[PDB]
Amino acid sequence: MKANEIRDLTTAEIEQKVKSLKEELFNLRFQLATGQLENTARIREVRKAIARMKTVIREREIAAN
RNA sequence: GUUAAGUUAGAAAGGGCGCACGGUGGAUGCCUUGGCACUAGGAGCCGAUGAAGGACGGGACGAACACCGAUAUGCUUCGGG
């Protein structure tokens, strides 16, 4: 997964992919708060995903600049 | 069993001296995760590309330490295991 963010398209698809898993994160926090989420570690790994694959965007932008 | 007058062990409310067994308390013994004085070498600055230092906040519960900064208990990317 540490490579796919570079391998796939430059910037376009990562954007709505960010918004999609941010949707997932919001849903995860809501089910956590109401006390129904089971697979907890999902909450960690989605945030890790967000961090890494917007870090990729930042480094790509600065490198291009 | 009476006179009569003489003589003395006897006691324990409690207490004193030793003996035994306990409590408390943290002395002494032993130890060290800290500290002191120094030797040899490196280094002797940081800051508007925002410092030193903080407040606030981040974790599958929530406080505190430590780490971190809304990419928040971390990440990408060269290595070592």
TrEMBL record:
Q: Which GO terms describe its cellular component?
A: cytosolic large ribosomal subunit
The Gene Ontology terms for molecular function here are: structural constituent of ribosome
Taxonomy, superkingdom: Bacteria
Any signal peptide, and if so, which residues? Answer: none
Q: Which UniProt keywords apply?
A: Ribonucleoprotein, Ribosomal protein
Matching Pfam families: Ribosomal_L29
CDD domains cross-referenced by the UniProt entry: Ribosomal_L29_HIP
InterPro entries attached here?
Ribosomal_protein_uL29, Ribosomal_uL29, Ribosomal_uL29_CS, Ribosomal_uL29_sf
SUPFAM superfamilies recorded for this chain? Ribosomal protein L29 (L29p)
**Is-annotated flag, keyword Ribonucleoprotein?**
yes
What family does this chain come from, according to its entry? Belongs to the universal ribosomal protein uL29 family.
Record-linked HAMAP family:
Ribosomal_uL29
Instruction: Report the protein name in the record.
Output: Large ribosomal subunit protein uL29
